[PDB]
């Protein structure tokens, strides 16, 4: 980070809203009658299937950020939430795996 | 005031009961830290 | 000093100060002058101009800056319990990216103040925005992601109070439509996602929807719910439009609970469509109207997959359209040019009764008229709000105008029969 | 606080206001709209009149809206508004 | 009475979590 | 010769106005065709509040001119202005 040279882990695979844009373009091409790269169409279908998974990952990132904000606020009582932190570390290990 | 200290301690005890209901992490350590802080406050009160 | 700052920051005390400022605004709105002349000596020039366009009269302009910039009128709803209240769903503040993507605003008919009475601020763009039909102090809307949020108009915290589930099973697609539906006893927080997730939710539970259903028809082709409406009293029946320009009835119950009908006449994604909102001495549940992005408006009927009639006078792609709530003839429309197109067919059919495109082309996207329909809020995306009052000679429908509306509908049936006979005979051999 | 500060700013967003004092019973204002010495003097007057108005209201009815009482005078439309802990008073123009 | 001795209940630090996670990503 | 009665009816049939009773210069209820005890008690408390308001005015400036003090009272909010000549009640609801 800027002023924090340590690698702040954006812990998640590459998420691009352009995938959603391509899915919308595919739906529009279905609506408007255009032949297209059906390999890309199948990839967009798989991406649409995994889009809820991407949303879950984004929500998990938001939850991690909220936990980080809470920790930054109450570092003085971060030990008070030691059990939740341990559960979160276990979940982080599972998600990394 | 002795009654004022009793009221403050009653608030502290209610908070302790709430924390026990919380089921958070590091409960005995937090209790010890709170006891030490109360000791510091009481030491100021004792100097007074 | 510090005690004064704490009392200002004190939650009960700050809430009391807020209610105090609210009553202060109520009194300052009640603060009329003392040198008045109510005899009407200043309305003669207005009466000298009343005979040339008094049917349209903008009332106020709920325009702000705290959340208005880069925030279109995403949705509009007049509160049922308090008809003097209207909402203003905001788009994602691109200019205020430091600010979040959604901050609700109250356009007020009870008072004329730029300060909204209720605000719901959240980090997602409010796609849908439904007011509480059966509740007095609740607020809810549709995220750009799709997870429905919760808020309260009476409260003092703009944050999303509760949030609906956000998951693959939950509203992954953006929540295109959502409304307070169901009975007062048996309610249904019906919502519609872009992918077709018909999301009947519960006001109590923000985790499990009462009835969640992704929608698809025509050999399970995915349903891009564009135009949304539903029948009065028919909770099962609902109106569906497609970005591919396909209309369909929606079934909530039944073995075919989902896309019931299938209609298509438009040449654009279904932009503006509202049910026949006027009920009088004639029951016209078997018909409706629709508009798309093809500079035209298509009337609809329950049994007619082909569109009923065409209001194609638009010189550009339409955005919104709504049948009037009292006059069957009247029906207002909107577009990105501010195409206020209040059209009373019994009054003016070939031309609209009130066709007023905005000079400079204000972006009229989402709108909601009065509960009586006496005024209709219209607003540019940048925030040029217009609430045009309605001339009662044009506004109030006649008593026979429902029987005469059935007469005009049969006349339209005969004229369309002539057109269809021309279509049949025009095919050459 | 800052919401109350913005509420005061909006009530004072109308230009030409002589002075509106978010006040306190201690003779000093929570947020006045004038120079500090005159603010303290008028805020002492505000605290005195606030106690007087509380007493007069209790003499009239001790179960009333314990929030405010405007005084729209031909010299200053004094919108006095005292809370239980904090207080306010808006010696404004009669037009608003 | 065997007072306390509750294993020194504390979780891995978030920076320590970041370190172990970077180690895993290197292993990934 | 009926302007006074017309004005009394207009302030009496006014929206939100619970009553327009002509009390004396001292404030005792002169025009009282109802329960005189409660009316006289309300008029005397109004006179006390008027004294407190005149005290507040003198705290601002003694010889100032007043239009109507808009006292926010839940039982009967009074947008009135007392004097030393008579006391006709001006107390109407802001919502009406």
Question: Helix/strand/coil (H, E, C) string of chain E?
Answer: CCCCCCCCCCCCCHHHHHHHHHHHHHHC
Contact of C335 with C311, CB cutoff 8 Å: no
Rounded CA separation C146/C260 (Å): 24
Number of domains in chain D: 1
In three-state secondary structure terms, C62 is coil
Cβ neighbours around A32 below 10 Å, total = 11
Nearest of C242, C252, C244, C249 to residue C301 by alpha carbon: C249
Assess B29–A contact: CB distance below 8 Å, yes or no: yes
Option in F65, F69, F75 nearest D71 (CB)? F69
How much is the CA Rg of chain E, to the nearest whole Å? Answer: 15
Rounded CA separation C143/D16 (Å): 43
Contact of D72 with F69, CB cutoff 8 Å: yes
- Rounded to a whole number of angstroms, the distance from the CA of B26 to the nearest CA of chain E is 6
What technique was this entry resolved by? Answer: cryo-EM
β-pair partners for C175: C193
Looking at chain E, which residue has its C-alpha nearest residue B32? E4
- DSSP secondary-structure letter at C171? -
Assess F70–D contact: CB distance below 8 Å, yes or no: yes
Rounded CA separation F4/F14 (Å): 15
Which chains form contacts with chain B, at 3 or more CB pairs under 8 Å?
A, E
Tokens 């009394």 — which residue? Answer: F8
Burial (CB count <10 Å: 0-12, 13-18, 19+), residue D46: buried
For testing contact with chain E, the best of A5, A68, A89 (most E CBs within 10 A): A89
Cβ separation E11–A7 shorter than 8 A:
no
- Rounded to a whole number of angstroms, the distance from the CA of A84 to the nearest CA of chain C is 22
Distances (CA, A) of F68 to A27, C91, C322, D76, F96: 67, 45, 47, 10, 17
Tokens 């021309």 — which residue? Answer: C422
Residue-wise burial string across C264-285, b where 16 or more C-beta atoms lie within 10 A, e elsewhere? bbbebbbbbbbbbbbebebebe
The token duo for A12 is 């998640």
- Helical segments of C112-198, H only: none
Concatenated DSSP letters for C377-396? Answer: EEE-SS--EEEEEE-HHHHS
Rounded CA separation A60/A54 (Å): 10
In three-state secondary structure terms, C181 is strand
Nearest of C110, C62, C57 to residue C90 by alpha carbon: C62
Rounded CA separation D25/C166 (Å): 50
Cβ separation A80–B26 shorter than 8 A:
yes
Rounded CA separation C204/C161 (Å): 12
Residues of C in contact with F67 (CB under 8 A): 34
Rounded CA separation F96/F81 (Å): 19
Distance of CA A50 to the CA centre of its chain: 11
Assess B25–A contact: CB distance below 8 Å, yes or no: yes
Contact of D56 with F49, CB cutoff 8 Å: yes
Option in F60, F68, F73 nearest D57 (CB)? F73
β-pair partners for C181: C188
Please provide residue C331's backbone torsions phi and psi, each rounded to the nearest 5 degrees. -160, 125
Composition of chain C by helix, strand, coil, percent to 5: 15, 25, 60
How much is the CA Rg of chain F, to the nearest whole Å? Answer: 13
Looking at chain F, which residue has its C-alpha nearest residue D64? F74
In three-state secondary structure terms, C404 is helix
Distance of CA D85 to the CA centre of its chain: 13
Helices A82-96 & E14-27, crossing angle to 10 degrees?
A: 10
- First-to-final CA distance of chain F: 29
β-pair partners for C182: C187
Rounded CA separation C342/C278 (Å): 14
Measured on CA atoms in the order D54, D57, D61, D67, is the torsion positive or negative?
A: negative
Strand ranges, E, within C162-208: 175-182, 187-193, 198-201
Assess A83–B contact: CB distance below 8 Å, yes or no: yes
Residue F36 sits in a domain whose CATH number is: 3.30.450.30
Looking at chain B, which residue has its C-alpha nearest residue A82? B25
Rounded CA separation D88/C8 (Å): 11
User: Containing domain of residue F75, as a range?
Assistant: 1-96
Contact of C74 with C89, CB cutoff 8 Å: yes
User: Containing domain of residue C15, as a range?
Assistant: 1-41
Strand ranges, E, within C84-236: 85-88, 102-103, 105-108, 121-122, 129-131, 139-141, 149-151, 175-182, 187-193, 198-201, 211-213, 216-217, 221-222, 225-229
Q: Which helix (H) or strand (E) holds A18?
A: helix A17-32
Distances (CA, A) of C267 to C247, C292, D43: 12, 7, 69
Concatenated DSSP letters for D31-86? Answer: B-SS-HHHHHHHHHHHHHHHHHHHHHHHHH-TTS-TT-EEEE-SS-EEEE---SSS
Please provide residue C140's backbone torsions phi and psi, each rounded to the nearest 5 degrees. -155, 150
In three-state secondary structure terms, A58 is helix
Assess A1–B contact: CB distance below 8 Å, yes or no: no
């Amino acid at each position: 980070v800027r002023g924090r040279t340590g690698n702040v882990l954006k812990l998640k695979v590459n998420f691009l809203p352009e995938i959603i844009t391509l899915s919308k373009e595919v739906r529009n091409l279905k609506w408007l009658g255009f032949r297209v790269p059906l390999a890309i169409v199948n990839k967009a279908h798989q991406a649409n299937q995994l889009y809820p998974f991407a949303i879950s990952l984004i929500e998990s990132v938001r939850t991690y950020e909220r936990t980080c904000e809470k920790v930054e606020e109450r570092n003085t009582i971060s030990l008070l939430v030691a059990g939740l932190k341990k559960e979160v570390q276990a979940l982080i290990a599972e998600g990394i795996a | 005031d002795h009654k004022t200290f009793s009221e403050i301690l009653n608030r502290v005890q209610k908070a302790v009961d709430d924390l026990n209901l919380h089921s958070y992490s590091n409960l005995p350590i937090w209790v010890n830290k709170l006891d030490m802080e109360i000791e510091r406050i009481l030491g100021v009160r004792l100097q007074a | 000093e510090e005690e004064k700052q704490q009392i200002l920051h004190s939650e009960e005390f700050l809430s009391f100060f807020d209610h105090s400022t609210r009553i202060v605004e109520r009194a300052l709105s009640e603060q009329i002058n003392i040198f008045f002349d109510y005899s009407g000596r200043d309305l003669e020039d207005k009466e000298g101009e009343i005979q040339a366009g008094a049917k349209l009269s903008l009332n106020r302009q709920f325009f702000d800056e705290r959340w208005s910039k880069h925030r279109v009128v995403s949705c509009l709803d007049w509160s049922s319990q308090y008809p003097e209240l209207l909402v203003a769903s905001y788009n994602n503040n691109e200019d205020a990216p430091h600010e979040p993507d959604g901050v609700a605003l109250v356009w007020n008919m009870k008072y004329k103040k730029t300060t909204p009475e209720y605000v719901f601020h959240c980090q997602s763009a409010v796609m849908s925005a439904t007011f509480a039909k059966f509740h007095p102090n609740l607020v809810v809307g549709g995220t750009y992601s799709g997870q429905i949020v919760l808020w309260d108009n009476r409260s003092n915290k703009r944050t999303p109070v509760q949030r609906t589930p956000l998951s693959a099973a939950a509203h992954t697609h953006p929540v295109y439509c959502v409304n307070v539906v169901g009975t007062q006893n048996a309610h249904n927080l019906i919502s519609i996602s872009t992918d077709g997730k018909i999301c009947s939710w519960s006001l109590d539970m923000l985790s499990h929807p009462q009835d969640s259903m992704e929608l698809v028809h025509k050999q399970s082709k995915a349903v891009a719910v564009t135009s949304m409406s539903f029948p009065v009293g028919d909770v099962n029946n609902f109106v569906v439009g497609s970005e591919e320009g396909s209309v369909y009835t929606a079934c909530r119950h039944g073995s075919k609970a989902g896309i019931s009908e299938m209609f298509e006449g438009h040449q654009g994604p279904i932009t503006g469509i509202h049910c026949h909102a006027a009920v009088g001495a004639v029951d016209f549940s078997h018909l409706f109207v629709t508009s798309s992005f093809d500079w035209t408006v298509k009337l609809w009927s329950t049994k007619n997959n082909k569109p009923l009639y065409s209001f194609e006078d638009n010189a550009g792609y339409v955005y919104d359209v709504m049948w009037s709530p009292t006059h069957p003839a009247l029906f207002a429309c909107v577009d990105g040019m501010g195409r206020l197109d209040l059209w009373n067919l019994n009054n003016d059919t070939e031309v609209p009764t009130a066709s007023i495109s905005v000079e400079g082309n204000p972006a009229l996207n989402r709108v909601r008229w009065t509960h009586s329909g006496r005024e209709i809020a219209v607003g540019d995306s940048e925030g040029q709000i217009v609430i045009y009052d309605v001339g009662e000679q044009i506004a109030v429908p006649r008593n026979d105008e429902w029987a005469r509306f059935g007469r005009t509908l049969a006349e339209i049936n005969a004229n369309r029969a002539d057109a269809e006979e021309e279509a049949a005979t025009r095919i050459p051999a | 606080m800052a919401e109350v500060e913005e509420t005061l700013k909006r009530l004072q967003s109308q230009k030409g206001v002589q002075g509106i004092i978010v006040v306190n019973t201690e003779g000093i204002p929570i947020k006045s709209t004038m120079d500090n010495p005159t603010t303290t003097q008028y805020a002492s007057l505000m605290h005195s009149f606030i106690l007087k108005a509380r007493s007069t209201v209790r003499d009239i009815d001790p179960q009333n809206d314990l929030t405010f009482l405007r005084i729209r005078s031909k010299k200053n439309e004094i919108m006095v508004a005292p809370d239980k802990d904090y207080f306010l008073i808006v010696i404004q123009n009669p037009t608003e | 009475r065997k007072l306390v001795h509750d294993k020194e209940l504390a979780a891995e630090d978030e920076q320590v979590f970041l370190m172990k996670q970077q180690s895993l990503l290197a292993k990934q």
